[PDB]
Symmetry: C2
Subunit: 100 residues, 2 copies
């Protein structure tokens, strides 16, 4: 009965079929059916803003410059896992390097 609501640090899965890491807080996400997230991939091309997600067999890197707003409820999202507070603080760090 209860629908999954993306939380900050969650690695979710979407359509649109691509992994992402949610930087938006649970309440924002729930009220707005949207979240801020960054896309992840099985391919690390060494671009500087790439943030390695630990020892990944699947979903190897997270792109912090690719930040964006998506409607998680609309396209649906499920939980592929969560992200080490390290990786989260870091990613926010990079993003700040760019946006700050």
């Amino acid at each position: 009965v209860s629908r999954y609501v993306p939380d900050m640090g969650d690695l979710i899965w979407v359509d649109f079929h691509r992994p992402a890491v949610v930087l938006s807080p649970f309440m924002y996400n729930n009220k707005t059916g949207m979240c801020l997230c960054v896309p992840c991939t099985t391919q690390s091309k060494g671009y500087p803003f790439e943030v390695v997600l630990s020892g990944q067999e699947r979903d190897g890197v997270a792109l912090a410059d690719q930040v964006k707003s998506i409607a998680w409820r609309a396209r649906g999202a499920t939980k592929k896992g969560t992200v080490a507070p390290e990786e989260l603080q870091l990613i926010k760090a990079k993003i700040n390097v760019l946006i700050g």
Copy 2:
């Protein structure tokens, strides 16, 4: 002749689930010139003249249209492909506040 490259603070206009379309549409550029130039991508947040009193809105004032930048709406977009053009820039105030709210969300 050199193409316009969007700079941090610039208000641009884009060709541009993916609700927002507004085939000719405003955005505020959060990425610095270098990055935008190299990547053909930039980070920006969408603008509209309609204020919903929504908590993440930032007022952009004084111009042809008084409006709001929607600061929870940050987007990585490809401006070269989408044909971004310069609509002028935002006061240091407004940009700073945008950054701030974004921090609210992700901080």
